[PDB]
Each structure stands twice: as C-alpha cells, then as structure tokens.
Amino acid sequence: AALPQDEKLITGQLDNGLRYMIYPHAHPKDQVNLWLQIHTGSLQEEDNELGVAHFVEHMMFNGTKTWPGNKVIETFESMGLRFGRDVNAYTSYDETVYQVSLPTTQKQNLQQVMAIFSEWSNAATFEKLEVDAERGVITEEWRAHQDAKWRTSQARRPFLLANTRNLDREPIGLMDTVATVTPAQLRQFYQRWYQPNNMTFIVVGDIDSKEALALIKDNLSKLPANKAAENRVWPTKAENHLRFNIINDKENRVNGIALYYRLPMVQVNDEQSFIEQAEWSMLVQLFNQRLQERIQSGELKTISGGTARSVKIAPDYQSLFFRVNARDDNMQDAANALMAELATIDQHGFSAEELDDVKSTRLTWLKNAVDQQAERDLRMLTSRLASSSLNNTPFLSPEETYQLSKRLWQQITVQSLAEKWQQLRKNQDAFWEQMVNNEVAAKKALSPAAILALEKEYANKKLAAYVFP
Ligand SMILES: [Cl-]
Ligand SMILES: [Cl-]
Numbered sequence: 185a186a187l188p189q190d191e192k193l194i195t196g197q198l199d200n201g202l203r204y205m206i207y208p209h210a211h212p213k214d215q216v217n218l219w220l221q222i223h224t225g226s227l228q229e230e231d232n233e234l235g236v237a238h239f240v241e242h243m244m245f246n247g248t249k250t251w252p253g254n255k256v257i258e259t260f261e262s263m264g265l266r267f268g269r270d271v272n273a274y275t276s277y278d279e280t281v282y283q284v285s286l287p288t289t290q291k292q293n294l295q296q297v298m299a300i301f302s303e304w305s306n307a308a309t310f311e312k313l314e315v316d317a318e319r320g321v322i323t324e325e326w327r328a329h330q331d332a333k334w335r336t337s338q339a340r341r342p343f344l345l346a347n348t349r350n351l352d353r354e355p356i357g358l359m360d361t362v363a364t365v366t367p368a369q370l371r372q373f374y375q376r377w378y379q380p381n382n383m384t385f386i387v388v389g390d391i392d393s394k395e396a397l398a399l400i401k402d403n404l405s406k407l408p409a410n411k412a413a414e415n416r417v418w419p420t421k422a423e424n425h426l427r428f429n430i431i432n433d434k435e436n437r438v439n440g441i442a443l444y445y446r447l448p449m450v451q452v453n454d455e456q457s458f459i460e461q462a463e464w465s466m467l468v469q470l471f472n473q474r475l476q477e478r479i480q481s482g483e484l485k486t487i488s489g490g491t492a493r494s495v496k497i498a499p500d501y502q503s504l505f506f507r508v509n510a511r512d513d514n515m516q517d518a519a520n521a522l523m524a525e526l527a528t529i530d531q532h533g534f535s536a537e538e539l540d541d542v543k544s545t546r547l548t549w550l551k552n553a554v555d556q557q558a559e560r561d562l563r564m565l566t567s568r569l570a571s572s573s574l575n576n577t578p579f580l581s582p583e584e585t586y587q588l589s590k591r592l593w594q595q596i597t598v599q600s601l602a603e604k605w606q607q608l609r610k611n612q613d614a615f616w617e618q619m620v621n622n623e624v625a626a627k628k629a630l631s632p633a634a635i636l637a638l639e640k641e642y643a644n645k646k647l648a649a650y651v652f653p
Contacts, residue, residue: 185454185455186453186454187452187453187584188578188580191581191583192208194393200404200409201379201380201381202383202385202407203384204384204385204386204387205385205573205579206391206393206397208389208391209389209558211561214289214390216285216286216288217389217562218283218285218286218387219281219385219386220384221570222280222281222377222378222382222383223278223279223383223384223415223574224237224382225237225277226238226277226353226357227277227278227350227415227416227499228415233373234357235355235359235361235362236370236373237275237280238275239322239362240373241274241275242318242321242322243308243310243314243315243318243374244256244273245267245273246315247310247311248309249307249309250307251303252309259300260284260297263286263296270286277350284297284301285562298400298403302406305383305404306378306410308378310367319363323359325356329356335433336433339429339431343427344444344446344503345498347420347421347422347423348418348497350498376412379410380404380407380412382412382415385404386573387399388562388569389562417499419500420448422446422612422613424612425613426612426614426615427614427616428616428632429616429617430618430626431618431620433620434621436619436621438488438509439509439515439620440507440509441616441618442522443522443614443616444614444615445504446497446501446503446611446613447504447608447613448500448501449500451576452577453577453578458588459593459596462593463600464494464604466539467604468492469492470534470542471525473542474529474650475489477652486514486517487508487517488509490521492504492505492506492507493505493507504608508521508522508525513625515618515628523642524642526609527639527642527647528648530606533602533605534598534601534602535649538650546589547589550585550589554586557581616632616635618630
C-alpha cells in the first residue's frame with residue numbers, strides 16, 4: 185500500500201519530460217530556493233571519464249551561449265548573489281545539483297535566475313580557455329580537501345564500499361583525467377546526461393503555486409524533448425567475510441572501537457518498507473539510549489561516549505555501526521564496554537518499557553514537528569525534498585509521518601526487534617575497526633584474535649538483563 189506525498193507538495197512534468205517539485209514555505213519570509221537536480225553523478229562515468237561529472241558541474245559557471253566566460257558569475261553578482269553563499273553546486277555519486285537562494289520580492293531577478301537555469305540545462309559552451317582554467321582549480325581542490333576526515337574515509341573505504349560501483353567512482357575522479365579530458369569529451373558527457381527527462385527543477389519557499397508554476401513553464405518548457413541515456417544500476421553484492429582495520433592518524437581527535445555491518449537499504453515507499461526502516465532506526469536508538477543511560481548513571485566512566493548509526497553506502501545499501509569512544513588511550517575498556525553491551529542485547533534484547541519510551545518520545549517530537557512545521561529550516565526542507573526526488577520515494581508531510589508512526593509502530597514489538605537483532609548479529613558482512621591517534625593507543629589497540637576472544641568471553645557469560653529506570 186503506497187504512501188501519500190505531502191498534501192502541499194506540487195509535482196508534475198513539462199511536455200519535454202522535465203519534472204518539477206514545488207513546496208510553499210515562509211521561514212524565512214520572501215525567500216525561495218531554486219535547485220536544478222540532474223539525476224546523474226559520478227556512478228555513470230565510463231572508465232575514461234573519472235571526475236567528468238564533477239568537471240561538467242564546474243563548467244556551468246564558466247560559459248553559456250548568452251553568458252560566455254565570467255558573465256554568469258557577473259550576472260549573479262549584479263543581483264547581489266555570491267558563489268559559495270547564495271549560489272552553489274555539488275556532484276555526488278548519484279546526482280549533480282545547482283542551487284540558488286534569493287528573495288522573491290524582485291520579480292525581474294527571479295526571471296533572470298530562471299534564464300541562467302535554462303542555459304545550464306542545454307547551452308553550456310565549454311570554451312577551451314575556460315576548461316584549461318578549471319583543470320588547475322579542480323587539481324587544487326583535490327589537494328585542499330585531503331584532511332584527517334578524508335584520510336579516515338579513504339582508509340575505511342575498501343571495507344565500507346566492498347562490491348559497490350561507488351568504490352570505483354569517487355566524485356573528484358583522477359587528476360590525470362582532469363589534466364587531459366578534452367572540451368569535446370566534457371561536452372559529450374553533458375549532452376548524454378543533461379536532457380530534460382533526467383532533470384527535476386525544485387522550488388521551495390515563499391511563492392504561490394501559480395507564480396512558481398509559471399516561472400518553470402515560461403522558462404523551461406522550450407528546452408528540446410531530447411532523451412538522456414538510461415542511468416545504469418549496479419546491485420551491491422554481500423562480502424561474507426569478517427574484516428579488521430586499525431586507523432592510525434595523529435590528527436584524529438577521538439580513539440575508539442566500532443563494529444560495522446553492511447546490509448540492503450529499503451526505499452520507504454509503502455507500509456511494509458516504512459516498518460522495516462523504523463525497526464532498524466529503533467534498534468539504533470535503543471542501543472544509544474542504553475549506552476547513554478549507563479554513562480549518565482555512572483556505570484561507564486571507563487569510556488567517554490559512543491553511538492549506533494545507519495549510513496547510506498550505495499543506492500541499494502547501508503551500513504549499521506556500533507561505536508564506543510575510548511577514555512584517552514584505554515582501548516581495552518572501549519572494547520569491553522562495546523562487547524558487553526552487544527552480548528547483553530544478544531541474551532535479553534530490549535524490555536517493553538525501553539521500547540515504549542522510544543515510541544512515546546519520538547511521537548511527542550513528531551506531534552511537535554506538526555505544530556512547528558511553518559518554522560522548519562528552509563535548507564534542510566529543500567534537502568529532504570531533493571532526497572525524495574533522487575530516491576523516487578514519497579515526500580511525507582509532518583502530519584502523515586506522525587499518523588503513520590502512531591499506526592504502523594504498533595506492529596513493532598520487543599519480539600519483532602529480537603528477530604531483527606538476531607538476523608543482524610548473524611550477518612557475515614561485517615568489520616571491526618579501531619581508531620588510534622598516538623603510539624600509546626596504537627600499542628593498546630586489540631589485535632583480531634583478542635577482539636574475538638573478548639567476544640567469546642562475553643558470549644559464554646550469564647549476563648544480567650538491563651532494567652529501564
Ligand atoms: Cl570526491
Ligand atoms: Cl568470516
């Protein structure tokens with residue numbers, strides 16, 4: 185049974201195939217976000233196109249038919265719109281998005297911005313001199329972003345992205361492709377993927393339905409009805425092997441231990457998939473709740489903190505990890521705390537009071553989210569709608585989210601979660617990870633045999649059931 189989209193959301197398609205999504209919002213008043221979403225990122229690049237989706241994105245600000253060279257930037261600047269502030273763009277594995285935020289009070293400026301979007305759609309020129317200028321830009325940005333977080337992501341990457349197309353398609357690409365790719369090759373990718381049926385224009389902000397629909401139709405319906413190439417899908421394959429990693433980086437600020445599981449990610453488009461996602465989310469929250477209760481009650485002063493989280497790793501896949509942050513260089517205490525909590529849940533699961541508290545506090549938040557919906561952050565709301573568009577999943581209103589949760593969560597029990605926990609714990613696609621920032625913590629890090637001997641020790645213990653306070 186298909187989920188309804190927010191009552192206030194306006195969706196549709198122009199005759200040329202371009203899709204649009206309009207959502208009214210008046211916080212801040214007289215502000216609108218205009219985003220052009222290309223449903224193609226780095227995943228679709230051929231072996232000789234590594235970083236071309238990202239290079240194409242940069243080329244939108246360096247020449248169009250009406251605005252050659254720096255004229256697109258000079259036009260935005262004449263309307264008080266600055267690159268990196270009001271005007272932005274990004275390329276990910278899944279998409280390329282072009283973003284403009286401006287007031288709604290100057291109608292000629294709204295029209296001017298729409299005229300620029302029309303030319304980014306099919307009239308970018310890729311001038312030789314401009315392409316050559318951007319090679320240096322991309323090369324410098326590639327080096328600049330190589331910080332501790334990037335080095336940690338690079339080290340985790342083979343473990344986290346095993347058997348994904350994402351592993352071979354990091355958006356920055358190769359500097360050797362950036363240096364040699366011809367303007368004709370950049371033009372080829374652009375004309376292959378930048379066609380109306382692979383585009384969604386998103387309007388979020390303080391504009392009425394009639395005016396927003398007219399902005400789109402008056403400026404984007406004349407784009408020729410060309411069909412883009414089909415976006416290919418690479419199904420992620422399980423890696424039924426337990427792996428181990430130690431990330432040693434002196435610039436990282438937190439030492440700790442984590443267990444990562446990799447599993448399919450269901451798209452929330454019906455009642456059954458809404459329940460499946462809610463069960464993984466609740467297992468994650470219940471873990472977090474128990475750890476925080478043990479820390480605040482004073483039971484765990486041997487550790488600093490920790491979390492459980494789910495992360496998207498590919499269009500069809502996710503990782504669920506359980507992390508405990510170490511107190512200084514005390515790697516043994518971190519491992520002990522994590523293993524002890526995972527084994528306690530293995531043996532007794534969660535209580536009816538623990539689940540009842542997670543549900544009631546989430547419903548309280550959801551109810552208040554309905555009451556305060558007019559005050560939602562514009563940027564966050566635009567991002568959620570862009571995400572629904574990318575995943576072809578219904579964009580639920582705060583009211584639908586609240587009503588669905590109140591009704592569908594009654595199918596979530598201590599028994600249904602115990603089943604899901606046992607399934608997750610038998611998942612062979614897993615890896616242990618430790619993070620160290622000095623040679624004392626590095627010497628203290630557990631080797632793989634020690635990790636598993638600690639797991640066996642806890643598995644064979646008759647551990648006591650946790651009692652919700
Ligand atoms: Cl990247
Ligand atoms: Cl194994």
